[PDB]
Protein backbone atom coordinates (compact mmCIF):
# COMPACT_ATOMS: atom_id res chain seq x y z
CA UNK A 1 0.00 0.00 0.00
CA UNK A 2 2.88 2.38 -0.95
CA UNK A 3 5.40 3.04 -3.83
CA UNK A 4 9.16 2.41 -3.61
CA UNK A 5 11.24 1.28 -0.61
CA UNK A 6 11.14 2.60 2.99
CA UNK A 7 14.83 3.55 2.84
CA UNK A 8 16.84 5.45 0.19
CA UNK A 9 20.41 4.50 -0.75
CA UNK A 10 23.42 6.89 -0.64
CA UNK A 11 22.67 8.09 -4.23
CA UNK A 12 19.05 8.93 -3.24
CA UNK A 13 20.11 10.63 0.00
CA UNK A 14 22.72 12.69 -1.86
CA UNK A 15 20.11 13.66 -4.48
CA UNK A 16 17.66 14.76 -1.70
CA UNK A 17 20.37 16.83 0.02
CA UNK A 18 21.60 18.36 -3.27
CA UNK A 19 18.10 19.67 -4.14
CA UNK A 20 18.85 22.19 -1.35
CA UNK A 21 22.71 22.31 -1.06
CA UNK A 22 23.35 22.84 -4.81
CA UNK A 23 20.45 25.31 -5.40
CA UNK A 24 21.38 27.91 -2.72
CA UNK A 25 21.17 31.64 -3.29
CA UNK A 26 24.47 33.38 -4.03
CA UNK A 27 25.84 35.43 -1.11
CA UNK A 28 28.41 38.21 -1.21
CA UNK A 29 31.60 37.20 0.71
CA UNK A 30 30.86 39.62 3.57
CA UNK A 31 27.27 38.38 4.02
CA UNK A 32 28.46 34.74 3.74
CA UNK A 33 31.14 35.27 6.41
CA UNK A 34 28.65 36.89 8.85
CA UNK A 35 26.22 33.97 8.30
CA UNK A 36 28.95 31.38 8.99
CA UNK A 37 30.13 33.23 12.16
CA UNK A 38 26.52 33.28 13.34
CA UNK A 39 25.96 29.56 12.59
CA UNK A 40 29.21 28.68 14.40
CA UNK A 41 28.00 30.48 17.54
CA UNK A 42 24.52 28.92 17.27
CA UNK A 43 25.99 25.39 17.06
CA UNK A 44 27.83 26.08 20.41
CA UNK A 45 24.56 26.94 22.25
CA UNK A 46 21.56 24.57 22.49
CA UNK A 47 19.29 27.51 23.34
CA UNK A 48 20.46 29.48 20.29
CA UNK A 49 19.63 26.44 18.04
CA UNK A 50 16.13 26.31 19.57
CA UNK A 51 15.59 30.09 19.38
CA UNK A 52 16.69 30.20 15.76
CA UNK A 53 14.50 27.24 14.80
CA UNK A 54 11.50 28.90 16.45
CA UNK A 55 12.18 32.25 14.74
CA UNK A 56 12.30 30.63 11.29
CA UNK A 57 8.98 28.76 11.83
CA UNK A 58 9.79 26.30 8.97
CA UNK A 59 9.46 29.18 6.48
CA UNK A 60 5.85 29.97 7.52
CA UNK A 61 6.52 33.21 9.47
CA UNK A 62 4.35 36.17 8.62
CA UNK A 63 5.64 39.55 9.74
CA UNK A 64 8.93 40.93 10.95
CA UNK A 65 11.10 38.72 13.15
CA UNK A 66 11.62 39.53 16.84
CA UNK A 67 15.25 40.62 17.44
CA UNK A 68 17.25 37.89 19.21
CA UNK A 69 20.33 38.14 21.42
CA UNK A 70 23.66 36.57 20.51
CA UNK A 71 24.53 34.31 17.60
CA UNK A 72 20.87 33.39 16.83
CA UNK A 73 20.24 37.10 16.20
CA UNK A 74 23.42 37.37 14.07
CA UNK A 75 22.11 34.57 11.81
CA UNK A 76 18.63 36.18 11.61
CA UNK A 77 20.23 39.45 10.43
CA UNK A 78 21.62 37.53 7.39
CA UNK A 79 18.21 36.08 6.42
CA UNK A 80 15.91 39.13 6.68
CA UNK A 81 15.31 42.22 4.61
CA UNK A 82 15.84 45.69 6.24
CA UNK A 83 12.14 45.43 7.26
CA UNK A 84 12.83 42.34 9.40
CA UNK A 85 10.92 40.06 7.01
CA UNK A 86 12.49 36.67 6.40
CA UNK A 87 13.55 35.87 2.82
CA UNK A 88 12.29 32.30 2.17
CA UNK A 89 15.07 31.43 -0.33
CA UNK A 90 17.68 32.32 2.32
CA UNK A 91 15.85 30.90 5.38
CA UNK A 92 14.54 27.58 4.00
CA UNK A 93 18.06 25.98 3.63
CA UNK A 94 18.79 27.01 7.25
CA UNK A 95 15.43 25.35 8.32
CA UNK A 96 16.59 22.11 6.59
CA UNK A 97 19.96 22.39 8.38
CA UNK A 98 18.26 22.91 11.77
CA UNK A 99 15.97 19.94 11.01
CA UNK A 100 18.95 17.68 10.34
CA UNK A 101 20.79 18.99 13.45
CA UNK A 102 17.89 17.85 15.68
CA UNK A 103 19.14 14.27 15.15
CA UNK A 104 22.64 15.05 16.41
CA UNK A 105 24.01 15.29 19.96
CA UNK A 106 25.28 18.42 21.71
CA UNK A 107 28.80 16.91 21.37
CA UNK A 108 28.31 16.67 17.59
CA UNK A 109 26.97 20.28 17.40
CA UNK A 110 30.15 21.55 19.12
CA UNK A 111 32.30 19.50 16.70
CA UNK A 112 30.39 20.96 13.73
CA UNK A 113 31.02 24.49 15.17
CA UNK A 114 34.79 23.57 15.33
CA UNK A 115 34.70 22.25 11.73
CA UNK A 116 33.01 25.52 10.67
CA UNK A 117 35.46 27.72 12.65
CA UNK A 118 38.45 25.90 11.15
CA UNK A 119 36.99 25.81 7.55
CA UNK A 120 37.25 22.00 7.66
CA UNK A 121 33.89 20.83 6.38
CA UNK A 122 34.94 18.93 3.25
CA UNK A 123 37.14 16.37 5.04
CA UNK A 124 34.38 15.24 7.42
CA UNK A 125 31.78 15.45 4.60
CA UNK A 126 33.83 13.12 2.44
CA UNK A 127 34.44 10.68 5.31
CA UNK A 128 30.77 10.47 6.27
CA UNK A 129 29.60 10.27 2.63
CA UNK A 130 32.15 7.52 1.83
CA UNK A 131 31.06 5.47 4.88
CA UNK A 132 27.36 5.85 3.85
CA UNK A 133 28.18 4.83 0.26
CA UNK A 134 30.30 1.83 1.27
CA UNK A 135 27.99 0.47 3.99
CA UNK A 136 25.17 -0.57 1.57
CA UNK A 137 22.82 -2.10 2.55
CA UNK A 138 22.32 0.11 5.71
CA UNK A 139 20.02 -2.51 7.26
CA UNK A 140 22.97 -4.92 7.69
CA UNK A 141 25.86 -4.66 10.14
CA UNK A 142 29.21 -4.81 8.30
CA UNK A 143 32.91 -4.21 8.87
CA UNK A 144 34.50 -1.70 6.50
CA UNK A 145 38.05 -1.41 5.09
CA UNK A 146 38.07 2.41 4.75
CA UNK A 147 40.90 3.72 7.00
CA UNK A 148 40.03 7.36 7.93
CA UNK A 149 43.68 8.23 8.64
CA UNK A 150 44.56 7.52 5.00
CA UNK A 151 42.04 10.16 3.85
CA UNK A 152 43.91 12.91 5.81
CA UNK A 153 41.64 12.79 8.90
CA UNK A 154 43.14 12.61 12.40
CA UNK A 155 42.19 9.18 13.74
CA UNK A 156 42.40 7.65 17.16
CA UNK A 157 40.28 7.61 20.32
CA UNK A 158 39.11 11.13 21.09
CA UNK A 159 40.01 12.65 17.68
CA UNK A 160 37.24 14.93 16.27
CA UNK A 161 36.32 12.55 13.39
CA UNK A 162 36.34 9.64 15.88
CA UNK A 163 33.96 11.43 18.31
CA UNK A 164 31.70 12.65 15.46
CA UNK A 165 31.25 9.06 14.19
CA UNK A 166 31.14 7.39 17.61
CA UNK A 167 28.24 9.71 18.52
CA UNK A 168 26.29 8.28 15.51
CA UNK A 169 26.43 4.75 17.00
CA UNK A 170 29.26 3.38 14.82
CA UNK A 171 31.77 0.93 16.34
CA UNK A 172 35.28 2.30 15.94
CA UNK A 173 38.78 0.92 16.16
CA UNK A 174 42.34 2.23 16.07
CA UNK A 175 43.32 -0.77 13.91
CA UNK A 176 41.45 -2.33 10.96
CA UNK A 177 38.47 -2.50 10.76
CA UNK A 178 38.53 1.18 11.77
CA UNK A 179 34.78 1.45 11.22
CA UNK A 180 32.01 -1.06 11.62
CA UNK A 181 28.64 -0.01 10.24
CA UNK A 182 25.74 -0.50 12.67
CA UNK A 183 22.15 -0.20 11.27
CA UNK A 184 21.20 1.85 14.41
CA UNK A 185 23.52 4.62 13.05
CA UNK A 186 21.58 5.21 9.80
CA UNK A 187 19.55 8.29 10.81
CA UNK A 188 22.36 10.07 12.60
CA UNK A 189 24.89 9.37 9.81
CA UNK A 190 22.39 10.62 7.15
CA UNK A 191 21.59 13.73 9.24
CA UNK A 192 25.33 14.35 9.84
CA UNK A 193 26.01 14.01 6.06
CA UNK A 194 23.11 16.47 5.27
CA UNK A 195 24.32 18.95 7.95
CA UNK A 196 27.94 18.91 6.60
CA UNK A 197 26.68 19.21 2.99
CA UNK A 198 24.44 22.17 3.86
CA UNK A 199 27.21 23.91 5.86
CA UNK A 200 29.63 23.32 2.92
CA UNK A 201 27.03 24.68 0.46
CA UNK A 202 26.34 27.75 2.63
CA UNK A 203 30.13 28.36 2.81
CA UNK A 204 30.10 28.54 -1.11
CA UNK B 1 29.10 35.89 -23.01
CA UNK B 2 27.75 37.04 -19.67
CA UNK B 3 24.80 36.05 -17.44
CA UNK B 4 22.87 37.97 -14.73
CA UNK B 5 22.56 36.29 -11.30
CA UNK B 6 20.97 37.46 -8.03
CA UNK B 7 23.52 38.05 -5.21
CA UNK B 8 22.57 38.89 -1.63
CA UNK B 9 24.57 41.62 0.12
CA UNK B 10 24.63 42.81 3.74
CA UNK B 11 22.63 46.07 4.08
Question: Do A85 and A144 fall into the same domain?
Answer: no
- For residue B9, the chain A residue with the least C-alpha distance is A28
Number of domains in chain A: 2
User: CA A53: distance to chain centroid?
Assistant: 14
Reply yes or no: is the peptide bond before residue A137 cis, omega within 30 of 0: yes
Specify whether A88 is located in the same domain as A136: no
DSSP state of B7: E
**What is the DSSP secondary-structure string of chain A?**
--SS-SS--HHHHHHHHHHHHTSPPEE-HHHHHHHHHHHHHHHT-HHHHHHHHHHHGGGT--SPPPP-SHHHHHHHHHHB-TTS-B-HHHHHHHHHHHHHHTTS-HHHHHHHHHHHHTT--HHHHHHHHHHHHHT-STTS-EEE---GGGGT---STT-HHHHHHHTTT-EE-SSSS-EEE-GGGHHHHHHHHHHHHHHHHHT-
Quick check: A66 and A55 in contact, CB under 8 A? yes
CA A48 to chain centre: 16
∠ CA A69-A43-A124, rounded to 5°? 155
CB atoms within 10 A of CB A31: 20
Strand partners, A121: none
In this structure, is residue A23 part of a structural domain? yes
Which residues of chain B does A25 touch, with a Cβ-Cβ cutoff of 8 Å?
6, 8
Together in a domain, A96 and A17: yes
A85 and A128 both lie in a single domain = no
Of B8, B10, B11, the CB nearest to A25: B8
Domain enclosing residue A60, as ranges: 10-103
A132, A167, A162: which is closest to A16 by C-alpha?
A132
B6 CB neighbours in chain A (<8 A) are 25-26
Return d(Cα A42, Cα A116) in angstroms, integer: 11
Chain B residues with CB under 8 Å of A87 CB are 8
Q: What are the residues facing A172 on neighbouring strands? A: A179
Cα separations in angstroms, A60 against A47, A63, A102? 21, 10, 19
Among residues A103, A137, A167, the one where a domain terminates is A103
Q: Name every residue whose Cβ is closer than 8 Å to that of residue A103 and which is 6 or more positions away in sequence.
A: A187, A188, A191, A192
Contact A28 B11 (CB under 8 A): no
Any domain includes A110:
no
- A87 and A161 in a common domain: no
The structure was resolved to a resolution in Å of 1.6
Q: Is the dihedral of CA A161, A166, A171, A173 positive or negative?
A: positive
Domain shared by A60 and A143, yes or no: no
Distance from CA of B11 to the nearest CA of A (A): 7
Evaluate whether residue A114 is within a structural domain: no
Contact A87 B5 (CB under 8 A): no
Contact of A34 with A77, CB cutoff 8 Å: yes
**Cα-trace Rg, chain A:** 18
B5/A27 Cβ within 8 A: no
Same domain, A128 and A63: no
Cβ-contact A28, B5 below 8 angstroms: no
Q: Are residues A97 and A139 in the same domain?
A: no
Do A74 and A128 share a domain, yes or no? no
Q: Are residues A61 and A131 in the same domain?
A: no
CB of A169 within 8 A of CB of A113?
Answer: no
B4 and A CB contact within 8 Å: no
Amino acid sequence: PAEGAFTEDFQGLRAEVETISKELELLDRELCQLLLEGLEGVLRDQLALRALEEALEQGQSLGPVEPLDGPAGAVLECLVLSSGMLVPELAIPVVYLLGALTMLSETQHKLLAEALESQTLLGPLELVGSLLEQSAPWQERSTMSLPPGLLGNSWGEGAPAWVLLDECGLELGEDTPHVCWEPQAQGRMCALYASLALLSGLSQ
Amino acid sequence: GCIKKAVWFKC
